């Protein structure tokens, strides 16, 4: 009834909208032939002289290219034969700093891994010792722990099912009146919301 | 009522908790102490033998490191002079290189620079002379564009009053009876829901 009438104005507006969109499209489509025109204006003059522009700039680029490919063979061949030297050079270096360092670093490890094997070998061992007086230690613990939590449970299962019989009992006792009482609460709500969504 | 009666079961089963946990830290206070108890006599124990034992390992590592720190150090010493006298023809050689590449890059970097310079300057002139027409045509174009966006906006706005004036009175005039049917439920939904409530 009511969204019936907001309609009616609503198709009056979209009317109007349409009479508006006449003049507006007409001078819109006006507007573009302007901006169009004067674009082309702009970009007729503008692409051709970019063109005049891009040509002496792309020549003068490639000639600076040209300049800096021949600065770059100028220095980065010679560069790279100096750098080469100067690698080798480094790599004699590190030759030195390799093949006597390396084979002093395996010796190190001589005297550090293979020290260090009679030294956790012995403490792996001697771990063995301290893990299985540990492990009994938790197992002597552990089992009478199992003993201790059995009895705590079952002293706790028990107590737990003495409450659970009247807990459950006093629920479902509750739950008759209390379900039946929430019911009428219900039954009301719904009739009476039925009315007002109506 | 009923938060209180569960508060209540909430109450007691905290305090037979509590009454619980007395004995329970006490059982574990007692425990714990007793695993500290031969904890620390093996603790005093594992750390009296690892210090004793530590003496030889670290005095073996430290003579190893002492070694392998001589003969890092010298090493290190002609290696450092290997490095240095090889830095020096290095760098020698790349300062050497620096003179004349550095001064044939700042003459190439000249005609670079010239070259853009004598390019630029006419290059700019023309893109002024771009933006003179480019900005001119946007004052032509600009012009009529704000003129015929002016005149649609007045016509927008008019035809924005034939909603301003009409379409708000008759939104308003079916917000006056929307609102009573709205009041009517609304005030009375209050009511069913404090029915339920309390
Ligand atoms: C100064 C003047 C001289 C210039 C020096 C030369 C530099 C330029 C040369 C090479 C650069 C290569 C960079 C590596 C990039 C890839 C990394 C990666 O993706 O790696 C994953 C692979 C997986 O394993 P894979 O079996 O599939 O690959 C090996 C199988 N294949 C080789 C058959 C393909 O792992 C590997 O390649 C792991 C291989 C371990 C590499 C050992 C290096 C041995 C050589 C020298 C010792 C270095 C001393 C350092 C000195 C300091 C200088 C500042
Ligand atoms: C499902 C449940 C299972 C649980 C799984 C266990 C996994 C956890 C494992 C590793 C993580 C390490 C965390 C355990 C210890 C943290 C205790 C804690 O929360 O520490 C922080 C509290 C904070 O207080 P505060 O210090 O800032 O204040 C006092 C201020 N005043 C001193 C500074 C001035 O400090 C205190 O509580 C005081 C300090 C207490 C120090 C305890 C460390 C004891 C060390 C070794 C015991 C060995 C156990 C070996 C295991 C094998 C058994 C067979
Ligand atoms: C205030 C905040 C505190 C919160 C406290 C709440 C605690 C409530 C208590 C326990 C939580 C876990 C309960 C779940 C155990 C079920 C036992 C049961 O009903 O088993 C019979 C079923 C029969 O087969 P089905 O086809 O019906 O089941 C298949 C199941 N479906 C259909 C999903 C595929 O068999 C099975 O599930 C297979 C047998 C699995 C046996 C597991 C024994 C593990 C033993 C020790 C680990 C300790 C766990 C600690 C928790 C208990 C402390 C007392
Ligand atoms: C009052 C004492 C009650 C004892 C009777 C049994 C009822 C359980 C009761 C309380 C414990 C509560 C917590 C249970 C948690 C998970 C329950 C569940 O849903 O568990 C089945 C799922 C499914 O995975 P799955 O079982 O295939 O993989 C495991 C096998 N895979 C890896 C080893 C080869 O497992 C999981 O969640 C992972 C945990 C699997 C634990 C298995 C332990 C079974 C222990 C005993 C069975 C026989 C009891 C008979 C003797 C007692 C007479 C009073
Ligand atoms: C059928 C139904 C089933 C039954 C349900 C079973 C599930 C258990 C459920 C509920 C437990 C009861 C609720 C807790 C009672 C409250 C105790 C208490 O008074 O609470 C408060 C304290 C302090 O808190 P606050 O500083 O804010 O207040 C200070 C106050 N103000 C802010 C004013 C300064 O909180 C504390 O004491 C909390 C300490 C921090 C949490 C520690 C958790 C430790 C858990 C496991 C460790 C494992 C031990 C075993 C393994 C060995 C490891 C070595
Ligand atoms: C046989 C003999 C065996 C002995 C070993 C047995 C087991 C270990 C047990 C006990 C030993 C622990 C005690 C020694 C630790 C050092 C504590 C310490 O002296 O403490 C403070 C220092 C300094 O303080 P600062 O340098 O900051 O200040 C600089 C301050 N300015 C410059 C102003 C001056 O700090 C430090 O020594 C920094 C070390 C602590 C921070 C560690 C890094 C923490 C961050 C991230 C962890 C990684 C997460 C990623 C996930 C991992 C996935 C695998
Ligand atoms: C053909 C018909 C032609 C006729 C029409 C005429 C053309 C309209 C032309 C121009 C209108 C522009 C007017 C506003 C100019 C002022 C701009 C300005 O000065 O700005 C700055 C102010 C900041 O203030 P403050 O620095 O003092 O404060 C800062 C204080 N604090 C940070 C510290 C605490 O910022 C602000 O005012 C922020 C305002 C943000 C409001 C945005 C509203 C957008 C509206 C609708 C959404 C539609 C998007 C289009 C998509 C359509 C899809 C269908
Ligand atoms: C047995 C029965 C048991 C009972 C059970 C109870 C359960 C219900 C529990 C909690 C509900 C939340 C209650 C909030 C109470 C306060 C409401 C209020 O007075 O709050 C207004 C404030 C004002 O804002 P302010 O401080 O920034 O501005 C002023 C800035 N000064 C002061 C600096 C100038 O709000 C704010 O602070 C934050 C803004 C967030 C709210 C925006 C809403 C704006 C209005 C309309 C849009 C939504 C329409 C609804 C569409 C949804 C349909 C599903
Ligand atoms: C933060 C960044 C730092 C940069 C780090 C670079 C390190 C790279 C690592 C290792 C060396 C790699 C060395 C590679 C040498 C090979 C160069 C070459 O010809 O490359 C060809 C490619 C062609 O790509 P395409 O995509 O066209 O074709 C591939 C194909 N379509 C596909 O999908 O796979 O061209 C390109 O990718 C782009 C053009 C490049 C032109 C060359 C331009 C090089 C010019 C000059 C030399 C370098 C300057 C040295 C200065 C010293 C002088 C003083
Ligand atoms: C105050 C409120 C009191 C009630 C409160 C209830 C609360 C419940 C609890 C929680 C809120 C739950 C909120 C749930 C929201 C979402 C419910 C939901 O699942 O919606 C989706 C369905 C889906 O329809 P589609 O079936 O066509 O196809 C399924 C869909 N593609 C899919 O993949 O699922 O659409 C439908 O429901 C179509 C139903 C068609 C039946 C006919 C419906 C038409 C019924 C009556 C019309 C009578 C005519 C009246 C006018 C007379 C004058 C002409
Ligand atoms: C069932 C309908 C029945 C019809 C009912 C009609 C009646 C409607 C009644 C009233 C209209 C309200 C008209 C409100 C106009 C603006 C009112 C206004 O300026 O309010 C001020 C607030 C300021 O909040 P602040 O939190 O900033 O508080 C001020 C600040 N703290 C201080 O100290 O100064 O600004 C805000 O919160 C922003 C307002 C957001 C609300 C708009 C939100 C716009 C939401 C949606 C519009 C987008 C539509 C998308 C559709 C897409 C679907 C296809």
Redesign the interface.
């Known amino acids: 009834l ?1 969204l019936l ?2 309609w009616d ?1 609503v198709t ?2 979209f009317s ?2 349409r ?2 969109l006449g ?2 499209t007409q ?2 489509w ?2 573009l032939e ?2 169009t025109e ?2 082309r ?2 970009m007729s ?2 692409l051709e ?1 970019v063109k005049a ?1 891009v040509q ?2 792309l020549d ?1 680029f490639q ?2 290219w040209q ?2 490919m ?2 770059y063979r ?2 980065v061949e ?2 790279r034969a ?1 750098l080469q030297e ?1 690698a080798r ?2 790599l004699h ?1 590190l030759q ?2 390799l093949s ?2 390396g084979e ?1 670093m395996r010796d ?1 490890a001589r ?2 891994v293979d ?1 260090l094997r009679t ?1 956790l070998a012995p ?1 792996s061992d ?1 771990l063995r010792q ?1 893990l299985a ?2 492990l009994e ?1 938790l197992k002597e ?1 552990g089992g009478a722990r199992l003993a ?1 939590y059995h009895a705590k449970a079952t002293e706790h299962l028990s107590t737990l099912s003495e409450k659970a019989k009247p807990a459950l009992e006093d629920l479902r006792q509750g739950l008759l009146p209390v379900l039946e009482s929430f019911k009428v ?1 219900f039954l ?2 719904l009739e ?2 039925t009315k ?1 969504l109506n």
Do not use: C, I, M, W
Request: without cysteine; negative net charge.
């Open positions: 009511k009438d907001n104005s009056s507006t109007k909208l009479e508006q003049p507006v001078e819109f006006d507007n302007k901006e004067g674009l204006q702009e003059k503008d002289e522009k002496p700039y003068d000639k600076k300049e800096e021949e600065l100028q220095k010679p560069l100096e100067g050079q480094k270096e030195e700093k006597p360092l002093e190190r005297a550090h020290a030294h403490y001697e301290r007086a540990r230690a613990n201790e609460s009301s709500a009476e919301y007002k």
